[PDB]
Design a protein around this ligand. Sequence first.
Ligand SMILES: CC(C)CCC[C@@H](C)[C@H]1CC[C@H]2[C@@H]3CC=C4C[C@@H](O)CC[C@]4(C)[C@H]3CC[C@]12C
Lengths: 427, 6
Amino acid sequence: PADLEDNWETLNDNLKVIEKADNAAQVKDALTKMRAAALDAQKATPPKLEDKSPDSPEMKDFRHGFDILVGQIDDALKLANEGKVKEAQAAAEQLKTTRNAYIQKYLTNFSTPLNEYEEVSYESAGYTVLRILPLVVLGVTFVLGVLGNGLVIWVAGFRMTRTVTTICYLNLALADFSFTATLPFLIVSMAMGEKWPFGWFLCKLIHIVVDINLFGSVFLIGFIALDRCICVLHPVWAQNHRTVSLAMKVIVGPWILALVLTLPVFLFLTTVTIPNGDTYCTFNFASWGGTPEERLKVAITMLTARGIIRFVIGFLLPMSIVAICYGLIAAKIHKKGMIKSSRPLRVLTAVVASFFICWFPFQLVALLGTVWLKEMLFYGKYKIIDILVNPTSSLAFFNSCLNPMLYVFVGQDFRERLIHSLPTSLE
Amino acid sequence: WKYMVX
Ligand SMILES: CC(C)CCC[C@@H](C)[C@H]1CC[C@H]2[C@@H]3CC=C4C[C@@H](O)CC[C@]4(C)[C@H]3CC[C@]12C
């Protein structure tokens, strides 16, 4: 067992002490601490992790790089024991160059998504059908989403009467429609092993439309829950204050919040080109500001902040609202008689179950991937997290075509209004 | 690690 993080923390910390010089034994004290850290860093090599065997063309080369690292440490160490602090610091500059090679080697392999279509570890027929499965789910979500939410845009948007309810369903329909309309670009990207055959402009346009509407979808779901909660708990306040004019103002909130949380996509998402002929639409971590050492710490904190916001703001906030609001509604109906209970109980327990079943797996996988970010960076561990992204993503994406039946067409006025709008159709 | 929506 060994921790590469504390090793490279010791290596970078002592490299700064060597630049301070100020003495001769101070360079020797730092280089000795660097040599101990480089030895442990050689012990933390993933030799057993990737084909455990002696004398290998790819396993004995990552261990040979530390020999050149330890070799350069001795070069600066022999010149330090001779009192010459100038030749010792000059040899430490080459020691920084190889350190920048390992940091870039960690960042490039990290920003490169693992192409599970060519890896031998996922060659079995089981993994082969589990890669087509999220593609099929996105396929049926594309057709059902653009039609299901398209009908709501037409019916509840132009055929029904402008109420607070129809405005809520229209915004929810415009969110899921704009999202599901980008599924063809994401299904061919997932089918090519996370590659991006589209331009740099589409890499930023599509993933912004995705993050804005998906954030909007869950935020509006919680907004509908809040509005439904106030009607049942405060019916007198609703008829005297719940107006269409007020709903026009307070509903821009969820969209502004979805727009701000998408700024990281607008600024740091771009098309990167791997050394061979492969293009990926990801965060270009190996092309940010500061020293290469600084690019390592800002990459973890950025993805940590992104994983926290995805879980807390993107799930804990709407899930708590949905659970509490419909829970307070279930208590208000349990109080008085069954006058308001015109909708079956399967309707009340579906908006809280469909939102949880669809989002919790993906939110759980993305959350585990955030707490194991460093384990994936220094060791490439927890590859099951990457494997489960697409399957759990498609499940959450499928919620964008279930909301029409859960919220809109579950009522009586919407379903019959759609029938009379289409001429000569089956009932 | 892969790019995740959210
Ligand atoms: C933090 C996440 C994970 C869970 C949510 C915890 C907090 C915010 C929740 C849990 C139960 C909630 C309460 C449940 C019921 C009521 C009664 C209602 O008339 C006013 C709000 C009030 C008092 C809620 C306030 C918010 C509340 C205290």
